[PDB]
Amino acid sequence: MVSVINTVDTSHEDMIHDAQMDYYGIRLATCSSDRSVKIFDVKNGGQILIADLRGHDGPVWQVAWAHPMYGNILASCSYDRKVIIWKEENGTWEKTYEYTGHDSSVNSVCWAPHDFGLVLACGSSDGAISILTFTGDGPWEVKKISNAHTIGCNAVSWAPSVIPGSLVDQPSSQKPNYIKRFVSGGCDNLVKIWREEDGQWKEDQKLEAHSDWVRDVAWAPSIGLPTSTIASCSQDGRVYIWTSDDAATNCWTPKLLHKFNDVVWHVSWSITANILAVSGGDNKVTLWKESVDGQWACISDVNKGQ
Amino acid sequence: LDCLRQLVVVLCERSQLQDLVEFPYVNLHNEVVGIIESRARAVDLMTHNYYELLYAFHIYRHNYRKAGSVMFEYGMRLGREVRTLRGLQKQVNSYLACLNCLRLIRPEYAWIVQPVSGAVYERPGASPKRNYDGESSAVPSSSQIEILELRDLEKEYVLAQTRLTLAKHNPSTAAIAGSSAAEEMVALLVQAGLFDTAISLCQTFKLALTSVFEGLACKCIRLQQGGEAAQAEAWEWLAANQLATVITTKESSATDEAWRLMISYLDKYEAKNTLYHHCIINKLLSHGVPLPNWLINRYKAMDAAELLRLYLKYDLLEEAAELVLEYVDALLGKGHQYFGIQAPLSATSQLVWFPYSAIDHLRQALGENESNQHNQAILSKLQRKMDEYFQKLKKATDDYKKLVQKPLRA
Amino acid sequence: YSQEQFSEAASLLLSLMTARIAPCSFWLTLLLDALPLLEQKQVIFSAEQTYELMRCLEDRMAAKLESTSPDEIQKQDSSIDNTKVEMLRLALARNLARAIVTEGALQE
Amino acid sequence: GTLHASYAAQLENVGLWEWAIFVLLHIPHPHIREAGVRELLNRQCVVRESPESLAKENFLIHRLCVPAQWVHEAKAIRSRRDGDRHKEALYLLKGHQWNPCHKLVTRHLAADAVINENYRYLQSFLGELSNPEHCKHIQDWETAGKVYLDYIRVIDMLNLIQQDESSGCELEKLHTKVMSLCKWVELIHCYTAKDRLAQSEMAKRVANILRVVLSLQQPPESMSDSSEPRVPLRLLAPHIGRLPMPEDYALEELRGLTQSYLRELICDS
Amino acid sequence: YWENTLHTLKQRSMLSLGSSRPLVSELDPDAPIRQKLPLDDLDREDDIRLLKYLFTL
Amino acid sequence: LRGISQFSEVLEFSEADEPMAEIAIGGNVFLFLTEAVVGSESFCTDEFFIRRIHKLVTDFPTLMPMKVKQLRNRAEEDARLIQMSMQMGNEPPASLRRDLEHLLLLIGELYRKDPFHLELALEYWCPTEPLQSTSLMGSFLGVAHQRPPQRQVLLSKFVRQMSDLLPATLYLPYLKMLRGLASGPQCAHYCFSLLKANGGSSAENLQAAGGSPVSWDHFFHSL
Amino acid sequence: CWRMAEDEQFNKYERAIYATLSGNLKQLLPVCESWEDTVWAHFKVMVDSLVEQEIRASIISFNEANELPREYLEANWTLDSVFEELQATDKKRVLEENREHYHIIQKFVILADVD
């Protein structure tokens, strides 16, 4: 039984596009068409607005929390072509960086695993993906993947730092081989996997099963599984689960999870990679779980009552 | 040394100060300075001129650095011990004399040495401060030494000068002004109505001008609510501020000149963020005063979304709805210049941020009062205009899609 | 000034500057006209009067910083004005040093 | 992997997260097991010492054999999020994270401890980091962490020499250490205005200590009644001119050095 | 040296087309430092590679 | 006796001040001063009557601050007892003492009228800002910064202390006290500034009803 | 070259090139990843420092106007101090390689310590 634990009045003046909890589940960031990002302390069924972040000139599409080892850092991306990095210092939030290297709307932002440092992926309607890296010394470094998707990139999601199975087959003295990978979805109906090799980003895999724009992509957290899992959703109303049992074979198998009667906007994994949330154009959020036979079942249809 | 002490004392008592300055003091110069410094430290600052004597003594020997140090110590002690109008006037003169001495020195050597504020100058001959157990407290063996440059002495001079200007304007404030930090002094100058001196002080100390604009807004509000007596008192503090153009035409009220002063300060002191305009508007709305059209029109051109949130914060639903109607008309291409919008809603124009959440809060606040036929008439006018906007947005988005779908044959 | 009444001239000039009746654009010229009176062997301006002049010089400098959009600090009229300002600073510092010594010698 | 992850997540939601660690420890794959255990610790480890939190930590360390280092690492990450730089440094030290601890202490705790004269507090961290097994693993130990520790040791030795009528051998060891510190205080990397203030206070204190040591190294055979202790200017001048002092204090020191040099020249004629 | 930056500067001299990232105006090695303006991203990558190899040699 | 005990030569009666004050408070002294003395039509006819009762009322909180603290703690206990009796459906005990309520009402009624323009209510107010009134250029005694007299600091601390965590039983007496202390041009402006300062501390967290019940925001929001 | 090695506006490898060429150990060490690189950086700067000391001792007419850092000019180099600094490094890889049997042999061969 899923129960509503808390209801947050965000006091946004226009449509909310994203809502992200911090790593500890004690802060909520929200972003809106009102061009603001709001941050709430969420404790014991109360909320307190702690920041109203202003710096975008258009609708803010996505927010993403960095890993807490780097402090309280939030990325935001917007229709105004900007990516903004916000940081809290001494209980005050400030704009620490602004990236304007995209020619169109920046639709998605995702922080890399903390093993890689402060690295942010940014997907844009200019069809490019930018990778922003902060080394601690000097300006943010930028690697731009030009023509990542035709027409536009809608979503980006980082792979886990450690390959599935690499902790089971290691005799006691080799460091885990950390491979920088992320997945993207675009307006060319493709899901694409990117890999860093020799300091360059290459298209590692091209995943073909959607018949219209890929709206969102989510790489599943690898908690002790030997398999890599990706979810994708599309304007075609389909949700696919992509699985790869061997990181060497580069073989990805699509499984149709469901076909909705309307557009599917978002897919999000639970931190334990055992539940997938799916958000449709029908104003519903559905929760999906894999059964022991590998079958996906809907375990909750949260009707927005009121 | 004891005969030298006796000579210095007897010459000071006889007022034979010239002989004391002219004597060569071969190898005894540091001891004479130490004796006169010890006496200048022991005696009352208003009755005997030992600092002025030490200054004359160092000027005569071209020791401008020590002359500056002595006059700076004199100015600091006057600020601590003598919180009178006459004490503040002597303090400003001693800091001016210090600055003049350091300007005669090469810039490389134009610095004074101070023990940090909190170094107990034990009065030479004070009984050792015994702890509760009767033991001599060990002298804290780090008199941290602060090096003051000419720029830091200019800040202390401006601070003493601002204390003196306040004390001249109101003699009762001299006791308070003597101890006030630069931040407290801004608040006191703002209460007195000495806004240019407060702005000059904020610029020298790099303080926020927010308290100056709030206080001027509060004086403008009190003037607008005040009778003939408040208008008479207003000419005194208005004259104390540099209106570079007071043409006393027989037709301007003191309230009109206070608003002209506010406009001139907003024009001279542009903040990068709308902070000063926001602060004034938020202050006016907190007192229920109708916003001036010139302030609305300037702020419409700068940030109309923040203005809408301010009207909503103070339940001004009618003005909030008129602002949204005009902002929607501006986006549709009617009056876009009044809102700073470079290009109206077209397939090729930059995306203007639409404050949809604030407009939805306005629609909710107008809708919660079902009994008010007026709020429903406003809400229906707003909805019809929002529909006109969404239809034109849909068309502009479809025409942008068509512009993107014509094939690159070039 | 032409009738060699320097004390009265100095007081009037100071009054004109402090009464804020002078146009801001004319403040440099007024300060420059004070320069010959500041450099006289005899202390004409008191320490208090000199502080006021210094304040006026600072107010102007502050006013110039508020009126100059960051895109016009590059054309050839900033160098002469800066030289005049430095000359005035030096003259004001020298007069202040002289006035403090003279005023202090009278109080002893 | 699904069974271990699902049951561990059920136990996490019920508040039995210490037993969710036990469930994850059954994962066959060492890297996945280690990642899952550290991830759960980083979420649920509390920095506040309650009797319940300490019972859960004792269960993990003593019953589950989880390395105490990983619990301290999770508490350090949480202390960083909460902005508590003291507890962050303490848990990085207990977690054997010497390099992160040293960088945190030098950048954010050392200046505040020097300005507030809280030398015992800075010595607890730098003393533990000073062990010969830990120092080899610390980047830039000699240029930062050692300089603050050697400064504290020079203050401690001076306070001991003021309380005991000390032997001349301890005064020579103090002199050699003070002379070394004068060279190394210049090499401290200042990132904040507070670090520059702390560097200037260290420089001022070290110069005053150097004067006191040079005055106390004199044999008592030059008592002509009426002159201040004759500090040998030739040994003092090369070291004062290298100390990063504030301009006002450097000018006072140069005036004191020039007046004392003029007095040496007037007494040798 | 800096072929892409040189190309982008020559193209800016021939076409007033809007909103490209401000790049260095001069081609001396001190121009990025003196002007605090970036090179073309390809020339910056080529220089980073070259400098790494020069260090190895 | 408390005034004299500050001076070394009368030790024999120095401890007899506190028990005599407790007996006086037990005799409803503040109620009698309010109804029988200040309530008399003839109290306001002689300036020196007002000055002497003013001094008696202001000497109590200045010379005996520990008794004022005891009266407060007792009124907070009595408020808890009344709240507990009301929750149990019982009448409040008839033995409850209203000593502090009567002191607040006495201050409120004493200052309600100032027929001789003595401005004696100003001793309860401490200026936090120097009034820039530029309009009496006419006495040549420059004295910057007298610290307010220790008496005026103690009385202004009493007015502020009486506002802090105000019990529902003391709400009306405290407003009546402020009404008495707000008689006169300067007194009214200081009272206005106090009520304005009580509102300013919580605009950003709408879910904690932690505003002072004696503030302009509470008065007009309630209306 | 010393000033160019300290300027953070330059790339880490350009700084390291000028650091190798000027004797700036602090700016060279950040690009040295192995034991062999770290040992080379210390020995290269040691030789460059000792050569610069002898040149300055021999040439009577050095103009004081171009100060290299005193720490580099007054460096008291020993063969032992290099290997003590290698043991004090924060670089995990170098500390692991410093325990390898051949690197221990190479250290003692360099020190001339057969015992």
Swiss-Prot record, chain C:
> Where does the record say this protein resides?
Nucleus, Nuclear pore complex; Nucleus membrane
| Record family assignment | Belongs to the nucleoporin Nup85 family.
State how it assembles.
Component of the nuclear pore complex (NPC).
Relate the protein's function as given in its record: Component of the nuclear pore complex (NPC) that seems to be required for NPC assembly and maintenance. Involved in nephrogenesis.
Q: What is this protein called?
A: Nuclear pore complex protein Nup85
Q: Which organism is it from?
A: Xenopus laevis (African clawed frog)
**The gene coding this protein:** nup85
